[PDB]
Amino acid sequence: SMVKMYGNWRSAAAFRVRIALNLKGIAYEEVFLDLDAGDQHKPDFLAINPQGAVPALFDGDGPPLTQSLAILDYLEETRTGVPLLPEEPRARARARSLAQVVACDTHPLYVPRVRTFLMENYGLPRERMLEFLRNAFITGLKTLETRLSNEAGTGRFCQGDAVSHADLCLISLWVGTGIFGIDTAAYPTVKRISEEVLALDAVARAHPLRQPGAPAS
């Protein structure tokens, strides 16, 4: 009778879903887990989510929905009022391709499990592990800047003049440049669009720094 999300303040995947829920006007409650303190591995949570996935979304009766892109499409197909994809198939594919530059090629390389594995498996200090994270960000940001700057499809937003899944993924990476201290001077098109997206109430309300567990700044 109300959507329930299990999330985390910092998670880019949780942020994407949170934005979509807000943009579409879907009432929900979010439960915040500490992913650094191993809440995702606790048996009581595992009782409702065996593989421990965050974010996890419960939409009334049914098993939970996981994986941020799959969830975004689920919301698109079940709540159609404010569409977050265009209608034309090539435009949809481009928007999804841009989203996946982030959600497939970039973000999975900097999740907490990877950060901890690099340190624990190789004995790398945090300072050296972060070289992997920074490289992921920079590689992704370079691709997005080139594509957004040179391709005809870009408008006010990543694809045309309507917010799409591409923008939700883009802003989720952009906020990470703040959280993880990546220089963004070289990506002015990414900046312009990210600020355009961040100016929206639905996006700002969902910002990691406005969630429980966040640091001050």
Nearer of residues 121 and 217 to a second copy, judged by Cβ: 121
Encode 90-123: b = buried (16+ Cβ within 10 Å), e = exposed. ebeebbbebbbbbbeebbebbbeeebeebeeeee
Residue type present at position 65: L
CA 186-140-130 angle, to 5 degrees, is 90
Which of 53, 54, 181 lies closest to 126, judged by CA?
A: 181
Residue spans of beta strands (DSSP E) within 15-54:
28-32
The response to whether 162 counts as a known ligand-binding position is: no
Amino acid at 131: E
DSSP state of 66: E
Using CA atoms, how far apart are residues 172 and 69, in angstroms rounded to an integer? Answer: 12
146 makes contact with a second copy (CB under 8 A): yes
Give the range of 17-25, 26-34, 35-43, 66-74 binding a second copy by CB under 8 A: 66-74
Place of tokens 């995702």: 40
Does residue number 126 form part of the binding site for a second copy (CB under 8 A)?
no
Q: Check residue 45 for interaction with a second copy (CB under 8 A).
A: no
Regarding 189 and contact with a second copy (CB under 8 A), the answer is no
Q: Which of 14, 23, 35, 65 binds a second copy (CB under 8 A)?
A: 65
Interacting residues with Cl ion (CB under 5 A): 53, 66
Altogether, the residues listed in the chain come to a count of 217
Q: Which of 28, 45, 74, 180 binds a second copy (CB under 8 A)?
A: 74
Is residue 51 within the footprint of a second copy (CB under 8 A)? Answer: yes
Distance in Å, CB of 105 to Cl ion, minimum: 8
Binding positions are 13, 40, 54, 68, 107, 113
Contact residues: a second copy, CB under 8 A: 50-51, 53, 62-63, 65-67, 69-71, 73-74, 77-78, 89-90, 92-94, 96-97, 99-101, 103-105, 107-109, 113-114, 117-118, 121-122, 124, 128, 131-132, 135, 139, 142-143, 146-147, 150-153
